[PDB]
Write a structure and sequence with these properties.
By secondary structure, the chain is mainly α. It is 34% helix and 0% strand. The radius of gyration is 9 Å and the shape is globular. It starts with 16 loop residues before the first helix and ends with a helix. The site of zinc ion has 5 residues, from α1. It is found in: Nucleus. This is Zinc finger and BTB domain-containing protein 17. It comes from Homo sapiens (Human).
Length: 29
């Protein structure tokens, strides 16, 4: 687990939610 979001600390499974997490940091969603 090499990547973590710097602004957010909350934790969850990296399958679905992480896709959205990274995506909403690129596109405001
Ligand atoms: Zn984040």
């Amino acid at each position: 687990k090499e990547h973590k979001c710097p602004h957010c600390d909350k934790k969850f499974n990296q399958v679905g939610n992480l896709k959205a997490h990274l995506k909403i940091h690129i596109a405001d969603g």
